[PDB]
């Protein structure tokens, strides 16, 4: 069995920095090309960088060159990615996977850089020049639909509960950056009291709103 | 030089 | 599935070969079986032969050569190769003698390398570089200089790259204070027609006071990363300027490779443990 | 670099379909391609290597092949569970590149958006930023547009688990002064499942 354990994910202002650790089990950082990839928020994968110890080979994406620098520690069997000058675009969930140098039949295939076949679970990398705030909840009222508009919170996530049919629309990013969302559900207008319970663990802000 | 055909 | 093809610039002659790395099980080497595809017009009278060079370089001390007549005539893989080519495809089949310097070279020409040479002539060309290769199949040391030094290793087989853990136990009953401990790797690559090679060296200022015990484990790992500026370093066979490992640990006529972890106390009582540094068979 | 273009941008198909996604490499490739099936949230998985080698554990219904610089990925029986985005990646050169994903949606009878319109609440107007919410619920396919009549942040939910439905929440946020300057607000919905645009509105 083989695994990678990805860690090192937390907020960081633009121009700050981070370090990512990828602990390797079932193999070595030296018999494997270890690759760090990233997926932006609701966007497409982009291989960030990768290294091989036995050769000291390093590769970075054109947009992640210089800002990132990868290396490893074969003592602990781990890989390390130093992300310097983290910027807003850099936000993602960052994944770690590996290209076993084996399968040549005998030795190291130094010229394959093949498929990244073992992915970890991915640590969320943030970038934001904004500090935690509390959600501002409003009631949306007029089959009639209604909800609570939970605007201007920071950062993910929120768990809006009502007192079936609740559709909370993915939290977005605004110009200032704050995470909005709306949570609505449709009920017949005949019975038009409803209780919205907004919970924000990062700010420990819990609000209850009445809609009718 | 050394090409490579499948089979 | 897959096979390596090579033909001359005239292309009248072609050689198809299943492998380009031959596994020396130490009792039966993967025999070099290939197929020669020719055109009758370009050969007419002249015969076609194929040769298995076992060169040694540094000097062309060609330690062995054998000839096989592609034509005139004199396996299932060869069968399948023929079925796609016809009569004018003919097999050659060399058997590698085990007592050969297993494919190795030196990191800069020099070194050791087999070779498949196919040529058409009336009397005794495609040049396919091949290799012979070997797959990887508890040392303990005590010294009483009294400054007792004991070293041990987990096992004698450490795959390439795989880190080596050295148990160090220092019982210093003498009046001299240890200023450093060095766990290093010496790669002895003797060209026999031997040199000390410093590759990995975990120097730690771990000082053991008089009448004191210092017991712990180091982890040192030999990697080709910092072994790049090491001329005369023994690498595995490089087919056409690829990159390869550190010359695996030979299992004993050419170049002989052994490896030793040296535990040295800088007071300089030293001990050494031999270990194996060969790849695993997938 | 190597622009590994992919097609279609997204495709629609139900259970049992035979999906075919074509990944063309602007520059030459030599059987170095991988297709990663990233579910929403979870991490990419390996499907294809060598352009045609079935990675161990990939269901045999999955396959792919090479026809030059046009590699292709096929799914014989698009099961209910093999819905994701599929990125193609040339592992040949450096810097590596991935495709741009081809979301495999679900298919249902073309449905119109159950539309509602909501104005800023008094609580919000007191705060000062009014967020009118034009809700287009249970609407298929995702292709719809909303126009504002008197800065729109559509928040398109993902496919529903009940019946494969999209819900869109077009939020228009405005400052108190500019919001008050106008009186009549409206959102107009253009949908392939609607004969003509559906316009909802209110007055300040």
XYZ file of C-alpha atoms in Angstrom, chain A residues 28 30-31 53-57 74-75 102 104-108 110-111, chain C residues 21 131 133 135 160-161 163 224-225 228 236 242-243 245-246 279-280 282:
36
model
C 10.497 6.724 -1.061
C 14.007 8.903 -4.097
C 12.370 6.101 -6.115
C 15.703 13.121 -5.155
C 18.021 10.467 -6.602
C 18.772 12.981 -9.360
C 17.870 16.273 -7.715
C 15.564 16.990 -10.651
C 14.625 11.306 2.630
C 15.392 10.878 6.329
C 9.861 2.088 -11.382
C 11.126 0.407 -16.550
C 11.531 -3.328 -15.977
C 14.897 -2.955 -14.264
C 15.703 0.580 -13.094
C 14.822 4.257 -13.045
C 14.428 9.155 -15.910
C 12.483 10.401 -18.950
C 18.352 -5.005 -20.640
C 23.138 -4.392 -21.074
C 21.750 -6.427 -15.332
C 18.494 -7.569 -9.411
C 18.871 2.301 -4.389
C 17.754 5.517 -2.720
C 17.709 5.222 3.405
C 23.038 10.296 -7.264
C 21.984 13.899 -6.557
C 27.150 14.313 -10.141
C 24.870 1.461 -14.312
C 20.082 8.267 -20.565
C 20.497 8.687 -16.818
C 21.601 4.686 -10.897
C 24.772 4.170 -8.880
C 17.377 -2.578 -7.292
C 14.342 -4.766 -6.578
C 9.299 -5.621 -9.936
